[PDB]
């Protein structure tokens with residue numbers, strides 16, 4: 001596992017709280033991206049990880065003049081263009097709901113108004129994996145109808161193992177415990 005080995009090398013070598021904070025954030029990003037890849041593989045949909053909204057609009061509506069509209073330059077993780085409806089997707093990996101609510105509010109209020117002006121039928125979809133239990137939670141009614149089962153095989157144990165080693169190495173470092 002090249003990803004695991006590279007994280008392990010970084011944890012073996014790190015000496016400072018600030019560099020450790022970056023490893024921690026990087027592990028959480030990699031765990032998120034791992035779920036996104038497994039999710040798209042299981043559903044046989046195109047895997048993407050952060051698409052500029054302008055690019056999404058140009059893919060679904062090539063004739064658009066972006067300059068006529070006030071397009072917020074957000075980068076949702078992914079999208080599905082069925083031909084009649086646009087599903088905006090964001091992956092989450094979390095034991096809680098707070099990050100889902102934050103992103104749902106941001107994309108609902110920033111994306112839906114301009115998509116209505118352009119004329120593209122759009123739904124905001126947030127798919128969250130609980131990394132401890134592997135349970136999947138979906139916000140997005142049309143996503144649920146298209147994908148009533150999600151036959152993923154998730155294993156987050158190695159991300160937990162890496163981050164726990166990092167936390168243990170800095171268990172007595174006040175500067176780090178605050179950054180985290």
Ligand SMILES: [Cl-]
Nearest residue numbers: 014015016019
């Ligand atoms: Cl260091």
Ligand SMILES: [Cl-]
Nearest residue numbers: 073074075076
């Ligand atoms: Cl964004």
Ligand SMILES: [Cl-]
Nearest residue numbers: 046079080081
């Ligand atoms: Cl697509």
Ligand SMILES: [Cl-]
Nearest residue numbers: 032092093094
């Ligand atoms: Cl996440």
Ligand SMILES: [Mn+2]
Nearest residue numbers: 049050076077
């Ligand atoms: Mn993202």
Ligand SMILES: [Mn+2]
Nearest residue numbers: 077090091092
């Ligand atoms: Mn995401």
